[PDB]
Amino acid sequence: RGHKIKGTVVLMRKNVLDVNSVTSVGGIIGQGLDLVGSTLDTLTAFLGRSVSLQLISATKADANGKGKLGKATFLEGIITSLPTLGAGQSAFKINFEWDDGSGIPGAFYIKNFMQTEFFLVSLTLEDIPNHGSIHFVCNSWIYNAKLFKSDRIFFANQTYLPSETPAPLVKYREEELHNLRGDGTGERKEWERIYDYDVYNDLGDPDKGENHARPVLGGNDTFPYPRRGRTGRKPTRKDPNSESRSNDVYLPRDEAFGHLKSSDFLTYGLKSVSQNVLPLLQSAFDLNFTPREFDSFDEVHGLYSGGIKLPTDIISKISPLPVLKEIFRTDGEQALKFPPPKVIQVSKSAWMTDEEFAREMLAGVNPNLIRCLKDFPPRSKLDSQVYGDHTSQITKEHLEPNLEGLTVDEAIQNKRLFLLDHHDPIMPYLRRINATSTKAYATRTILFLKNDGTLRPLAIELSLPHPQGDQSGAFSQVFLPADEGVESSIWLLAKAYVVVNDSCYHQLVSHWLNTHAVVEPFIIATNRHLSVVHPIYKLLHPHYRDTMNINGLARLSLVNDGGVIEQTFLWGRYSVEMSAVVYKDWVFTDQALPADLIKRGMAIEDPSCPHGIRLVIEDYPYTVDGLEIWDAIKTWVHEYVFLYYKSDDTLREDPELQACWKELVEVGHGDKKNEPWWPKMQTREELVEACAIIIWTASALHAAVNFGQYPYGGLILNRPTLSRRFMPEKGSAEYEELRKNPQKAYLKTITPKFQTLIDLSVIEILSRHASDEVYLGERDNPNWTSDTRALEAFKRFGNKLAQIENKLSERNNDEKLRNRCGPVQMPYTLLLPSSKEGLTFRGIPNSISI
């Protein structure tokens, strides 16, 4: 019998997801009469000769082997309500002529004949033979059909390895993969979905002047770098090897996510801080309605209570900015306020303590760098310059004080000495950096694990390049802890010089290089080579949400020439170059949490222990909490991979996975293509490991290093971003100023008031979860596969994360674990998987989304 297949299309109109139309001011969303489509009839526009869908048979082919096409059919009618219809979603009825000749639909083509694009959410088919409903999850913007050569195609729910693809769909699956790759030529346009690679030749503006030029990162041995998404803009006129600047940076269309709520448009907020808030605030300082300099610590604390008095000239141009109404507290006229950072909510002065300084290396914004000291004195990895065939100038006489009464040899034996080494990355650039307004040191800090389980800083080494040349080693000075008099003020400054090194390393390497930059080539390789239908595509896809968008924004506004990072952080104009130098030492398999802990000497392998490793510092909150989430991720990945691959041979035989990984190594991270540590993709265990590392990187690692930025460093005093003065010398006038007024001396050493305001405004956005964040584990978008085994496995994953959330909260109430809270009384909640919106100090998103 000839029968009609009943379809329901769910879509979302442009107006409901677009920044320009959704900006009134934003407060409630997910709500409304869950904007049921029908009401307010722009919906009738979709109902004529506007939108056509054409079914493609999965089980029946034409003469040349491609699935049989049905008749192009138009949207018939509006569905007013459905039990699962969401906020902003509109539903349409469409009935397809099909018969028992053309078999089971497995894909469809769609054509939009309207002027305006819409976001296609889903197709659902209610069918004909002994067959359940067929679901299609689309989540894609559909532009006008005249813009494309072949029609937009979408496949059903069914997950298929290349060998498992229904014969009539084989050519459709390969053709879309081809269309996603492009041909490597052309300027990319907004409506396109073309994924390809380019180097970082994107950040400078050499047409504006030679001092605005920035070196090309990647594709050479001096500055290797991961690739980023190809945009295809015309080169600069002055330099052929650099790409010209634009106010719009292309990314493949479905990588840019819209939002139902105005305040969830965070990249928009960030861009507005660069383009609108930064030049306008800079005008208050280039005048005098704001004094240029903080004069006291009380003046810093006033940012959070009464705020900073600005004229209403600037205030009335900054307060009605679309997304920024949430993050900028405004009393009325004479104040820009900032929310109190968690670090000072219980105690204003606890950050100054040695124990908080030390604790923040284990549970702070950059909890990833500390190493156990294996030999003494600490050595440098630098080349022919002679302090690197020499050592640190910290001596054994320096480390014998008050606490445990051990010798240095004993304390190394018993694994009680630890190092935070910031000597090598900055050293080669120090002479250049100190020729600007910045004055910095290369630092080392040695820490002792006390009997009470907490860490204590024992000595700080400050090093400068050269009395008489670089071949002459390091000029080093050593500073010891002190709690009274001028010597305590010196020690606080020594601590600030370390933290200034740490903040810059954190921003550029721990955060930017190790999450953002390193992940982007994996997104490109995945889309280029794995069909949407591939199991591993589905495993990885939630972990890529909005990453290319925030990275494109970073290229424009954050990491560009004269952008926020160069103006705010210690390394200045060398910031991104130096991160390429650090990338020379990046190894993919050491990003796995257990490998990292082992590599830094913070754990030893031990099968007697809960995660197979024994920690050397038991109360190391980042690492003990991280290991629960790492193990949950790796278990999920293993269960999932082993649903699909029957043997290692079926993995070796998979052409999509093999081409993905070959292009990842040879092109995406192509400056490291000959490194021997890359997984070969010859074994299911190597696939598990690679996939776990990408998901850990995108989710927990980025969250751990990102979401504590405002809570710890919203007080500039605790995490200063640059230094401007060398240490006061014993008989100068600066030492007397330190004696008479140490707060003023502290303040004129660290980040000035202007750059403090920029820093705070940026890290307040960076530390916020949007309302519509999708978190690790439980959360996905929809009906993403019809494989009930995968659904069950994913549910087990969600359940384990909820169990881990309870265990983690319980550790926060344990009084024996002092590193979890500190004198600052800030329970470590950074690795708690779930969160509400805002500046919470918690929540692990699936992806790098901000």
Query: Alpha helices, DSSP H only, in 102-257?
Result: 170-181
* DSSP H stretches of helix in 262-331: 266-272, 278-285, 297-301, 312-318
Cβ-based nearer residue to Fe ion, 263 or 706:
706
Asked if residue 531 lies in contact with residue 158, where contact means CB atoms within 8 angstroms, the answer is no
Decide if 543 is catalytic: no
Rounded CA separation 26/270 (Å): 17
Minimum distance between the CB of residue 266 and Fe ion, rounded to whole angstroms? Answer: 10
The active-site residue out of 259, 506, 516, 541 is: 516
- Alpha-carbon distance of 442 to 470, in angstroms, equals 14
Q: Which stretch binds Fe ion (CB under 5 A): 253-261, 279-287, 438-446, 700-708?
A: 700-708
In the bound complex, what is the minimum distance in angstroms from residue 573's beta carbon to Fe ion?
22
CA 74 to chain centre: 42
Give the nearer residue to Fe ion in terms of CB position, either 445 or 849.
Answer: 849
Closest CB to Fe ion among residues 157, 551: 551
Distance (Å, whole) CA 748 – CA 735: 13
CA distance 424 to 474: 11
Applying CB under 5 A, the span of 92-100, 253-261, 496-504, 701-709 interacting with Fe ion comes to 701-709
CB of 376 to Fe ion, least distance (A): 36
Which 120-179 residues touch Fe ion, going by CB under 5 A?
none
Identity of the amino acid at 49 = R
Q: What's the rounded Cα separation, in Å, for the pair 196 and 199?
A: 11
Q: Is 669 annotated as a binding residue?
A: no
The residue (of 368 and 706) whose beta carbon lies closer to Fe ion is 706
Count of residues of this chain found to bind Fe ion when the rule CB under 5 A is applied: 1
- Taking CB under 5 A as the binding criterion, the range among 104-112, 624-632, 670-678, 702-710 that sits at the site for Fe ion is 702-710
**Rounded to the nearest whole angstrom, what is the least distance from the CB of residue 558 to Fe ion in the complex?**
9
- Give yes or no for a contact between 456 and 450, defined as CB atoms under 8 angstroms apart: yes
Annotated binding residue at 674?
no
Question: DSSP letters along 650-669, please?
Answer: HHHT-HHHHHHHHHIIIIIT
Neighbouring C-alpha atoms within 13 Å toward the C-beta of 837: 14
Q: Is 225:583 a contact under the CB 8 Å cutoff?
A: yes
Instruction: Give me the least distance between CB of 777 and Fe ion, in Å please.
Output: 20
DSSP symbol at 413: H
Q: Which of 541, 611, 702, 769 is catalytic?
A: 702
Secondary structure (3-state) at 463: strand
CA atoms within 13 A of residue 834's CA, in its CB half-sphere: 13
Of 64-72, 420-428, 443-451, 705-713, the window that binds Fe ion (rule: CB under 5 A) is: 705-713
End-to-end CA distance of the chain: 54
Provide the minimum distance between the beta carbon of 516 and Fe ion in the complex, in angstroms, as a whole number. Answer: 6
Applying the rule CB under 5 A, the residues between 336 and 355 that interact with Fe ion are none
- 542 vs 709: CA distance, rounded Å: 24
Judge whether 516 is annotated as a binding position: yes
Classify residue 337 as exposed, middle or buried by CB count within 10 Å of its CB (0-12, 13-18, 19+): middle
User: Would you call 511 a catalytic residue per the annotation?
Assistant: yes
Nearer residue to Fe ion within complex by CB, 22 or 763: 763
| Of 270 and 496, CB closest to Fe ion | 270
The token pair that represents 103 in the structure block? 């078999």
Catalytic residue among 527, 706, 718, 846: 706
Q: Is 551 a catalytic residue?
A: no
Catalytic residue among 110, 128, 524, 850: 850
* C-beta nearest to Fe ion: residue: 706
Between 85 and 848, name the residue whose CB sits nearer to Fe ion: 848
Annotated binding-site residue? 638: no
From the list 259, 511, 638, 769, the catalytic residue is 511
Residue 694, marked binder: no
CB of 705 to Fe ion, least distance (A): 8
Sole window of 5-13, 374-382, 698-706, 831-839 interacting with Fe ion (rule: CB under 5 A): 698-706
Backbone φ/ψ region at 57: left (φ over 0), alpha (ψ -120 to 50), beta:
beta
Largest CA-CA distance found in the chain, in angstroms, rounded: 101
Known binding residues:
511, 516, 702, 706, 850
Residues in contact with Fe ion by CB under 5 A are 706
Known binding residues for Fe cation:
511, 516, 702, 706, 850
Catalytic residues: 511, 516, 702, 706, 850
